[PDB]
Amino acid sequence: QVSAVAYELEDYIAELIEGAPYEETILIDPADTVPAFITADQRMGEANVPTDSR
Amino acid sequence: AHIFVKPELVAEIGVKQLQREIVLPGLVWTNPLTDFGGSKNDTITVRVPAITTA
Which of A8, A11, A10, A16 minimizes the C-alpha distance to B53? Predict the structure, then answer.
């Protein structure tokens, strides 16, 4: 019972994170994966999001 | 001509039959169950516990 509630809470959080209104999705190229994450950092930056606590 | 009575000498010089080295027994789960006598068909049934959903 406790395990079920714990997993339901983690799924609640995951639904929150996955269901957020993302206006666009960054496509990771499997052969060259790093540029996608540099793009993610860039999108965070141009939005003036603080660099700590990410 | 000359006749010499000689033995047939047998020697061991460390030439053996090349034969495999054993590694598999040490890596597999051996005897988590022992009481096969005393269970029908020599079969012990393992119970996998339950998980719920919240």
Answer: A8
